[PDB]
């Protein structure tokens, strides 16, 4: 099955998921000189005060922080979006070294990691229905650079030792995702896809301009996770990013001048 190695990584995914070669794949390189300012775009509304995290999971690719999405508790609206999108999970992509790890790039610059906050359009009732629609998901993408520690990340880092290997989960209640956001909500937006199989072309991407800072020690803990299951040969969970895909017939729009 799919992964990030030489024999199962991104260049192979098209054989089981032919949309990998589709017209609206993600991630992409954001060329800052050609993204146009769109004064028609709104400020993004991120309303995470009532978010209810439940659990953290090592799914063998990354780890997922899961939320209760059975009510409008943690929602994204505004920006480029019509209607209301409910938070279901967040996860990260990261590198073996600080010079790689992000999925999106900015003028070909790779960040050390990228955080994806995944939200589904409430008009489709559930996540599984949403991913079948071109406007089903909104993903907030946030770059990570290595510098100062991010205090709001430490609770996640703390728990990783308990979910080392594929299939392990742990209770992860009362975690506040607001502590993962940068100061500014300036963004770029474009239509794309999930960045892991099944690569469905159901996402409005909202990529924040301002990265967050995390410490080297925080990142290093991500790189101690394992892609393998318990008692199998150790293969460090690093370099779990898909490279940039062709932009094709798309425009990237900027919320800011």
Curated annotation (Swiss-Prot):
Consequence of changing residue 4 to H: Reduced proton transfer rate
Outcome of mutating residue 61 to A: Reduced CO(2) hydrase activity, rescued by 4-methylimidazole (4-MI). Reduced proton transfer. Enhanced proton transfer. Enhanced proton transfer capacity
GO cellular component: apical part of cell; cytoplasm; cytosol; extracellular exosome; myelin sheath; plasma membrane
GO biological process terms, semicolon-separated: angiotensin-activated signaling pathway; carbon dioxide transport; morphogenesis of an epithelium; neuron cellular homeostasis; positive regulation of cellular pH reduction; positive regulation of dipeptide transmembrane transport; positive regulation of synaptic transmission, GABAergic; regulation of chloride transport
Activity regulation comment: Activated by X-ray, histamine, L-adrenaline, L- and D-phenylalanine, L- and D-histidine, L-His-OMe and beta-Ala-His (carnosine).
GO molecular function: arylesterase activity; carbonate dehydratase activity; cyanamide hydratase activity; zinc ion binding
Gene3D superfamilies linked: Alpha carbonic anhydrase
Fine-tunes the proton-transfer properties of H-64, annotated site positions: 4, 59, 64
PANTHER family associated with the record: CARBONIC ANHYDRASE, CARBONIC ANHYDRASE 2
Listed name of the protein: Carbonic anhydrase 2
Underlying gene: CA2
């Amino acid at each position: 099955h799919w992964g990030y190695g030489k024999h199962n990584g991104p260049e192979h995914w098209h054989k089981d998921f032919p949309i990998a070669k589709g017209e609206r794949q993600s991630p992409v390189d954001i060329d800052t000189h050609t993204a146009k300012y769109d004064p028609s775009l709104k400020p993004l509304s991120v309303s995470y005060d009532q978010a209810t995290s439940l659990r953290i999971l090592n799914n063998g690719h990354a780890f997922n922080v899961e939320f209760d999405d059975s009510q409008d508790k943690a929602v994204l609206k505004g920006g480029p979006l019509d209607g209301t999108y409910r938070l279901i999970q967040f996860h990260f992509h990261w590198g073996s070294l600080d010079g790689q790890g992000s999925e999106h790039t900015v003028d070909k610059k790779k960040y050390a990691a990228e955080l994806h906050l995944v939200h589904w359009n409430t008009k489709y009732g559930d996540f599984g229905k949403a991913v079948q629609q071109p406007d089903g998901l909104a993903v907030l993408g946030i770059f990570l650079k290595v510098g100062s520690a991010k205090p709001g990340l430490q609770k996640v880092v703390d728990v990783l030792d308990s979910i080392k290997t594929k299939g392990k989960s742990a209770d992860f209640t009362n975690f506040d995702p607001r502590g993962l956001l940068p100061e500014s909500l300036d963004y770029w937006t474009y239509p794309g896809s999930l960045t892991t199989p099944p690569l469905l072309e159901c996402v409005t991407w909202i990529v924040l301009k301002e990265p967050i800072s995390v410490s080297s020690e925080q990142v290093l803990k991500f790189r101690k996770l394992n892609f393998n299951g318990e008692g199998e040969p150790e293969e460090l969970m690093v370099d779990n990013w898909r490279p940039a895909q062709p932009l094709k017939n798309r425009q990237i729009k900027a919320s800011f001048k």
